[PDB]
Curated annotation (Swiss-Prot):
Protein location: Cytoplasm
HAMAP family: Lipoyl_synth
The protein's enzyme class: transferase
Lineage, top ranks: Bacteria, Bacillati, Actinomycetota, Actinomycetes, Mycobacteriales
Residues annotated for [4Fe-4S] cluster 2 binding in this entry: C48, C52, C55
Protein name per the record: Lipoyl synthase
Major location (coarse): cytoplasm
One Gene Ontology term, aspect cellular component: cytoplasm
Family note: Belongs to the radical SAM superfamily. Lipoyl synthase family.
Cofactor: record remark: Binds 2 [4Fe-4S] clusters per subunit. One cluster is coordinated with 3 cysteines and an exchangeable S-adenosyl-L-methionine.
Length: 278
């Protein structure tokens, strides 16, 4: 499963000491994604100011804002010659602007140096603050993603810093700004199949274009227990359900990480968007 483009990329990463989520989180898709020249980057440090029971990011006091991070990310993207880059980060309630500047500047830096690279920006909610969100939207990523992750009943318990309505509102906000929007559902957290169906419906109504539906992998014993393993035939049904609701791009199964096939999904959302308005 090891190809020449994966090989070139790992060489470049090693020699330059570039940090990627792909290597550092031990993602099993790396062979496939790097062959398509797609990679994922973490900004804002690895200590989040919030706590979600499914999430592998540690909660802690974040280090000082590193304003050189955007340049650093854009340079890694350039060095790797990526066709698609995902930028993700933690919540930054310690910062007065929630880290809005950092997210936007990273996108702007990437696009200034990599005009042919599609950029996907996965954001926290910024408290749903219109002016923070507007700052981020203006950066103009190819995809604005904000993952609701689970259904309302479970959401209110294991994402105490968020609300289901505010998050859906982030997606609606991004859709009005003209962005292609994306969200993720994590199955195996205790949700019912019916709750999954209404959540997909909610996301579609919120204006979401791309949805990924994946299996919960419990990070450690301190984290939320796995409530089930979804069968393949069940992922297929959910995927067909989402396609039938009119999502432009749908991916379901053991995806391990939310950025799996991000480039292909964007392409489908862009192709269908062009098709519609032609
Ligand atoms: S999901 Fe986001 S806000 Fe919640 S712990 Fe993980 S990084 Fe922090
Ligand atoms: S799925 Fe995401 S984290 Fe994993 S290799 Fe692909 S781009 Fe990197």
């Amino acid at each position: 499963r090891i190809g020449p483009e994966y090989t070139e990329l790992k060489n470049l990463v090693r020699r330059e000491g570039l940090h990627t989520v792909c290597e550092e989180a031990g993602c099993p898709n790396i062979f496939e994604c790097w062959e398509d020249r797609e990679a994922t980057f973490l900004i804002g440090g690895d200590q989040c100011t919030r706590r979600c029971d499914f999430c592998q990011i540690d909660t802690g006091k974040p280090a000082e804002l590193d304003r050189d991070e955007p340049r650093r990310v854009a340079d890694s993207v350039r060095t790797m010659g990526l066709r698609y880059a995902t930028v993700t980060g933690v919540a930054r309630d310690d910062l007065p602007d929630g880290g809005a500047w950092l997210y936007a500047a990273t996108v702007r830096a990437i696009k200034e140096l990599n005009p042919s690279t599609g950029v996907e920006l996965l954001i926290p909610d910024f408290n749903g603050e219109p002016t923070r969100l507007a700052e981020v939207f203006e950066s103009g990523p190819e995809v604005l993603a904000h993952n609701v992750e689970t259904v309302p009943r479970i959401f209110k318990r294991i994402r105490p810093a968020f609300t289901y309505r505010r998050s859906l509102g982030v997606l609606t906000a991004a859709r009005d700004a003209g962005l292609v929007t994306k969200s993720n559902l994590i199955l195996g957290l205790g949700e019912t199949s019916d709750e999954v169906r209404t959540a997909l419906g909610d996301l579609r109504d919120a204006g979401c274009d791309i949805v990924t539906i994946t299996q919960y992998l419990r990070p450690s014993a301190r984290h939320h227990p796995v409530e089930r393993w979804v069968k393949p035939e069940e992922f297929v049904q959910f995927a067909r359900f989402a396609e039938g609701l009119g999502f432009a791009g749908v991916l379901a199964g053991p995806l391990v990480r939310s950025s799996y096939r991000a480039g292909r999904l964007y392409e489908q959302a862009r192709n269908s968007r062009a098709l519609a308005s032609r």
